[PDB]
Amino acid sequence: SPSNTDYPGPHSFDVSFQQSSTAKSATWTYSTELKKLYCQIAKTCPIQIKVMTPPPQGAVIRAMPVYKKAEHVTEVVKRCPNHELSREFNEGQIAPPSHLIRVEGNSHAQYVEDPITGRQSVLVPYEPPQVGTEFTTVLYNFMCNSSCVGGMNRRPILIIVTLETRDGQVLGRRCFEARICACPGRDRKADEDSI
Amino acid sequence: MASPSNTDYPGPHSFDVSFQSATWTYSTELKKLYCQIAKTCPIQIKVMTPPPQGAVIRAMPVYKKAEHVTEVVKRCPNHELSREFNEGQIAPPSHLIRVEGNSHAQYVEDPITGRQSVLVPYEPPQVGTEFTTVLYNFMCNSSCVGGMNRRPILIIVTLETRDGQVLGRRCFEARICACPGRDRKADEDSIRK
Amino acid sequence: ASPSNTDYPGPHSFDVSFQQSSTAKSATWTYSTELKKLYCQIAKTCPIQIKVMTPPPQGAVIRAMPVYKKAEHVTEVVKRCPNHELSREFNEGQIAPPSHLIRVEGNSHAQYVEDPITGRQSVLVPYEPPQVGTEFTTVLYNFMCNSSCVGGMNRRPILIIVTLETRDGQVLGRRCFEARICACPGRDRKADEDSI
Amino acid sequence: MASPSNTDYPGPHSFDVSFQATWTYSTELKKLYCQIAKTCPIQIKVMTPPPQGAVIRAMPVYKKAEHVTEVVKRCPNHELSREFNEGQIAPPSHLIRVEGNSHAQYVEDPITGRQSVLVPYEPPQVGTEFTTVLYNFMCNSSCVGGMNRRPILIIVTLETRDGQVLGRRCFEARICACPGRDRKADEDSI
DNA sequence: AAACATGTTTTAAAACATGTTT
DNA sequence: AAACATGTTTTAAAACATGTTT
Ligand SMILES: [Zn+2]
Ligand SMILES: [Zn+2]
Ligand SMILES: [Zn+2]
Ligand SMILES: [Zn+2]
């Protein structure tokens, strides 16, 4: 299984979330001290990238899901069959109906499965912020609930976003848990009460 | 052309269907069948004069709400592809309704309408029995995402001539769920308005 | 492969049967003919009646071998649970291997045997014709574990396979019956009977 | 010698044991009902600190005189089974085990053949009034080949580094499958 | 024999988790 | 949001099966 350890690296690589409009019906929200994303299915979810020094030539940003619990860590993470086949969300998408993670607003995006591992992940060419901007924003879409039967089956997962050299050398990586449910607002308020 | 009829039609042979926290339960006041997935469901047929020759009994599911009637009712992709319940089995894996205990049961998909149903040759009751019994199995829960997506359905059991002329028809709503007992009681209190 | 359990009267019309089952409510054993099943308390002696219609050959023998009833289990040898196999109780000064489920009492020629390849255990007795004026040759069997013995039969039904054989193990006849070794043969039998 | 004593002896340090489902304890019957292998928390209390290498020993013994002389051990089934015996520092025969303490040491008396398990005594955590010991019982009371439904008593003893007894408390233990049911049973029985 | 004892299974009820409707 | 809907899990109670005690 692939690494899931925070490694800031040569470019002080960092992922973070802009304000989580606590406005009850927020499409997604983020608990900082839980290191957890609460996102509704398919809704676009902006992620912030910051680097302390410019990265290599044609560096890239990969996003890969993986289960949290040790017992499942071995098993790939993809969309449950119901979702993989159903008409919704698939319409005319440049992404394979199996991949749980999609990037929005980037035709340079490119999805991928590893012949060997057969693990699914989406890559995007790193691109520095615009003038007077501190972050590079990447738009993500998560295509199944963390409760789809025939998929995550209510089995927690976490996203492993990593920065890499055009040829796969790991320049940095960060990780957060992701529960994609119907009420991120409520499921977060509650999670913050279990303690 | 139009969506299959759902009006009761006793017909010339006075065709009627009836039912005897168990595997299922039937509310007569709501004409609705509550039952667990894949479990066996006994349905009682009754006629008052023997039906014709190759007379058959066909069961076909169809959505209850007008908003959905035009969509064929089938199993969700999950269940249709799963190994579970489809191992040794002659029912095409997509068919919602199956019949167990009858080797003559034949599944059919309309070449034009694409509708799926399962027929059984009609046979009179056993000697001293008043009912011909048919054993039905329902292969998806009503809530199956990718399938019925909790849209209510009606079962349309129809007595037909060897060549598909309808001789009788009875209907009832079917709610395939995990706790027929609970859910039925729910609907019952719901009207306790 | 798993040994055969089909009745085979054979050339000598070999048959097995049981005398009165004395019901008594507290009988040490009882046999249901309609279920071909023997109900009997552990260790208590169990008389079985053999009958032939023509004398068997020379060193002809009678072998009794237990085997699981259900296909799911047929391949597992039937032996005593570890508790009983190690206990002093019953193994006191016995000539019989402490692991063997079936024993025969009252016969010094009885010989226990474990198949070197199959590992199956059985007990043989040299065949002897009935006493003068008697129609049956009687064999006294003892069953050393209750059916429910954890670590052993674990409530898996068994069948007893009594077989008439040639001095060199060629089978001449075979009869079978289910055996339920329990604490209240009376109760349990009545149970199975009401059950149907 | 004679069979180990079972009389309560608070001793100089006012040694006492008590209890805070997987188990339940009846105070009126001084009897512990609990499932096999499931963890059982027991609360020790002293009023003055025990000596140096002071230890807490737990030893099972039959309750009825008819049986007191027989060592209490695991039935052959459980003693040989792989189940509960895989990676274990406890000898597979010992009825009583302690979980969560690497210093726990099992012992068999060379002469009496009795088995028990000791744990070095340690004062409660700061702001806690009880030292807690986690006990596991590895056979049901009914185990054929073992306890064969003969009731037992647990004898938890506070001892000096060299086995001089400083305090002793006792309680009956019934290891079964439904502590709840069985306890209610004994309660109605009276 | 009848009543009990006691581990297992079956059934029933609540409680959860989480998506939808009002 | 608040209430509901609905499959899963947890807990509780009965019912079994079967050996022991009275
Ligand atoms: Zn899905
Ligand atoms: Zn389905
Ligand atoms: Zn045994
Ligand atoms: Zn044991």
CSV table of C-alpha atoms and ligand atoms in Angstrom, one decimal, chain C residues 83, chain D residues 36 73-79 95 138-148, ligand 4:
chain,number,residue,atom,x,y,z
C,83,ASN,CA,-11.7,-35.1,27.6
D,36,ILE,CA,-15.4,-16.9,29.6
D,73,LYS,CA,-7.5,-26.0,36.2
D,74,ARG,CA,-8.8,-25.7,32.7
D,75,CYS,CA,-10.6,-28.6,31.1
D,76,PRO,CA,-8.5,-30.6,28.6
D,77,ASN,CA,-10.6,-29.2,25.7
D,78,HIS,CA,-9.7,-25.6,26.3
D,79,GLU,CA,-6.2,-26.4,27.5
D,95,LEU,CA,-7.9,-21.0,34.8
D,138,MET,CA,-10.6,-19.4,30.8
D,139,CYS,CA,-13.2,-22.1,31.3
D,140,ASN,CA,-16.9,-22.0,31.9
D,141,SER,CA,-18.0,-23.4,35.3
D,142,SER,CA,-19.8,-26.2,33.5
D,143,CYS,CA,-16.7,-27.3,31.5
D,144,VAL,CA,-16.8,-31.1,31.3
D,145,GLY,CA,-13.4,-32.5,32.0
D,146,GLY,CA,-12.7,-29.5,34.2
D,147,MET,CA,-14.8,-27.7,36.8
D,148,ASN,CA,-17.7,-29.9,35.7
G,4,ZN,ZN,-13.0,-25.6,29.6
